Design a protein around this ligand. Structure first.
Ligand SMILES: [Ca+2]
Ligand SMILES: [Zn+2]
Lengths: 610, 155
């Protein structure tokens, strides 16, 4: 049977029919031997009524190629921390056994990726970007940025790796080319027309991380940005028409890292040395307009950046302000600690970048020849020079943590008598903590934490746990009191933690003014013993500036920095599994691998219709 | 080009070729039309190195494996150090795309090795072992082997 002989056996039998088919293919179809046999066999299969295999072979040599697409494969490799060698063992494994290999080899993953990483698609900025090279193919660059390594100067010790900013921007936006064109079609807007009127709004976040169990300090810092919204402007009269708004901005999977350093947040010297070129790009990109081949056409974008993912330690550090138990507590308002226990609500937003610059001028030139404390007072806390602009905004997640540590400390005080005995020792504080922790374990089932992470603060700020420690406080008025307190807090909480309160909870906004006022009045009254002249700063932000911010900046909580914070978790697993192994190469590898992890094109296949 | 043409145009463009092929097949193989034109494809593709084409065509025709024995998969999972949850993620992701499901689900691995693990086959001894119980289906036991846990003793 011809299915039993060797292939040499075959050639040596079927030579003449091959010659006949090649000659007829020459004289009638163009010399195409391949296709002429493909459609021959395809029609002999459709002779029998064997439709199904005729279809499998029909979709087999066109459109789809091999079993599963290479990109689906690169994505699964990525989404599972699969080592290159682990992947090849599996490739050999699934291929040798019943294949019909399905996965693709490594070197085609390595060749089909350059489409996903930065530095591949062309662009042009009109007008030309300021003090930025015009090559559009820069991949991962090392962050020292041409440091003059000579030993006698400050040393170039610190290791870093970074993309050029704009290239990562353009890569993540051509990644969003899919959804922006789908938003263009869904709205039934014109496609070829209205190409130069786009508007992108971009949240960027920065943060460091301590006790990175390395394998120079322990602490590592990760600088990342996220695509928040894209809206349309052309052709006029109207405003920005939103096209795309991020459905889950708080997720990690939507947080794109740009630069990694093995540096601490503290030394300002090394942080600005590395992160300078980045500031100039942002500042240099604000003016020009982007020109990109998207949806088949060259099109023009403009940008609005919103720095909101910073913590307050760094928000105040990066703005010349003094930290953190300072007299000027508020980053937005000018009240001292005293002035923040007196007046809780009546306030107006003042702080921004430029006035901070001019007031630093007032601090450095000293035109009025004032003494230190009063030069301190004319500038209202502006000492060091701001190096970077951050939206004056509040962070959601750490606010929840602060109120949770305050209520934890308040519960510790109430179990015992703090308003009876105004001066306790540490013994009763640990003792009060011990009965609270026992009470928390028996009721609600929550063992204690060395430090209250956000999820424990979600379980903390609920009414049942609160009533399980309310049952410890003997006086029934202080009990009912802090219970009414907990209830007022629970009504105004979803106002800031929600993505768009104007839509998801309009009613807490409308009674927000009254609800925060009643909170502040009841606190001042039945708690003056604790809140005479010392309040924490998040409580200020939340009793003074939330309605104003959320009305001004159409949404809150949607910009917190949580999305980036939890991603450090992934950074940690990427330092474990894909180590280079070298510090020199290893940051570059993490970045590469983590950029891929955070792509959307690869996240569409990670879902696979759920 | 006869690639993007409709059916019956390729039909009457290649009637004489298919007639010559069927005549030759009846001449040498009893008349199995399909197998001849299938090996014509075999050798026509393997001429240019795209062996990948030839493999997937021998993949369709009475293929060995849509799918894998569940044992090979359990083995894959334990030999690639795959987390159970990651493998499940992969299973869902690789099944939704072009998946007829190939990898087996997790819960079929768990009963698949109840044969691979200890304490399964029936066995005995003669003479009966000493100071060893005769129960043979005892699986993983913690080794303390009966420590008399009271505190004051050696703990
Ligand atoms: Ca942080
Ligand atoms: Zn303020």
């Amino acid at each position: 049977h011809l299915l039993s002989l060797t292939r040499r056996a075959q050639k040596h039998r079927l030579r003449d029919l091959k010659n006949q088919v090649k000659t007829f293919a020459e004289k009638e179809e163009g010399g195409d031997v391949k296709s002429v046999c493909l459609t021959l066999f395809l029609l002999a299969l459709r002779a029998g009524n064997e439709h199904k295999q005729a279809d499998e072979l029909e979709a087999m040599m066109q459109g789809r190629g091999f079993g599963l697409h290479p990109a689906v494969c690169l994505a699964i490799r990525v989404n599972t921390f699969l080592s290159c060698s682990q992947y090849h063992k599996m490739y050999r494994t699934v291929k040798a056994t019943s294949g019909r290999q399905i996965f693709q080899p490594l070197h085609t993953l390595r060749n089909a990726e350059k489409e996903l990483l930065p530095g591949f698609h062309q662009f042009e900025w009109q007008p030309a970007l300021k003090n930025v090279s015009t090559s559009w193919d820069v991949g991962i660059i090392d962050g020292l940025s041409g440091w003059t390594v000579s030993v006698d100067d400050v040393p170039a010790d610190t290791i870093s790796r970074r993309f050029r900013y704009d290239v990562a921007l353009v890569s993540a936006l051509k990644d969003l080319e899919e959804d922006i064109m789908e938003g263009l079609r869904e709205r039934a807007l014109d496609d070829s027309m209205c190409t130069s009127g786009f508007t992108v709004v971009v949240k960027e976040s920065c943060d460091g991380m301590g006790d990175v169990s390395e394998k120079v300090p322990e602490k590592a810092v990760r600088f990342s940005f996220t695509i928040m919204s894209i809206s349309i402007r052309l052709e006029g009269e109207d405003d920005g028409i939103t096209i795309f708004q991020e459905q889950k901005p708080n997720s990690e999977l939507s947080c794109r890292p740009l630069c990694l350093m093995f540096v601490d947040e503290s030394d300002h010297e090394t942080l600005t040395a590395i992160l300078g070129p980045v500031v100039a790009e942002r500042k240099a990109m604000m003016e020009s307009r982007l020109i990109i081949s998207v949806g088949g056409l060259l099109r023009s974008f403009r940008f609005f950046f919103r720095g909101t993912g910073y913590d307050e330690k760094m928000v105040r550090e990066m703005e010349g302000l003094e930290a953190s138990g300072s007299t000027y507590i508020c980053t937005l308002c000018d009240s001292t600690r005293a002035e923040a226990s007196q007046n809780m609500v009546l306030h107006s937003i003042t702080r921004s970048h430029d006035e901070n610059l001019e007031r630093y001028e007032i601090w450095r030139k000293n035109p009025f020849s004032e003494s230190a404390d009063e030069l301190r007072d004319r500038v209202k806390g502006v000492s060091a020079k701001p190096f970077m602009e951050t939206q004056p905004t509040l962070d959601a997640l750490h606010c929840d943590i602060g109120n949770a540590t305050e209520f934890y400390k308040i519960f510790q005080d109430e179990i015992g008598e703090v308003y009876q005995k105004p001066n306790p020792s540490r013994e009763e504080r640990r003792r009060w903590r011990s009965t609270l922790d026992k009470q928390l374990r028996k009721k609600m089932k929550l063992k204690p934490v060395m430090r209250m992470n956000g999820n424990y603060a979600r379980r903390l700020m609920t009414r049942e746990a609160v009533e399980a420690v309310c049952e410890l406080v003997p006086s029934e008025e202080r009990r009912e009191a802090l219970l009414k307190l907990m209830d007022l807090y629970l009504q105004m909480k979803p106002v800031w933690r929600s993505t768009c309160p104007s839509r998801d909870c309009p009613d807490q906004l409308c009674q927000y003014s009254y609800n925060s006022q009643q909170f502040a009045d009841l606190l001042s009254s039945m708690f003056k013993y604790r809140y005479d002249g010392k309040i924490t700063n998040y409580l200020h932000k939340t009793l003074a500036h939330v309605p104003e911010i959320v009305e001004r900046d159409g949404s809150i909580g949607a910009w917190a920095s949580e999305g980036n914070e939890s991603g450090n978790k992934l950074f940690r697993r990427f330092r474990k599994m894909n180590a280079r192994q070298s510090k020199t190469f290893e940051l570059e590898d993490i970045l590469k691998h983590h950029w891929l992890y955070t792509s959307k094109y690869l996240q569409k296949f990670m879902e696979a219709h759920k």
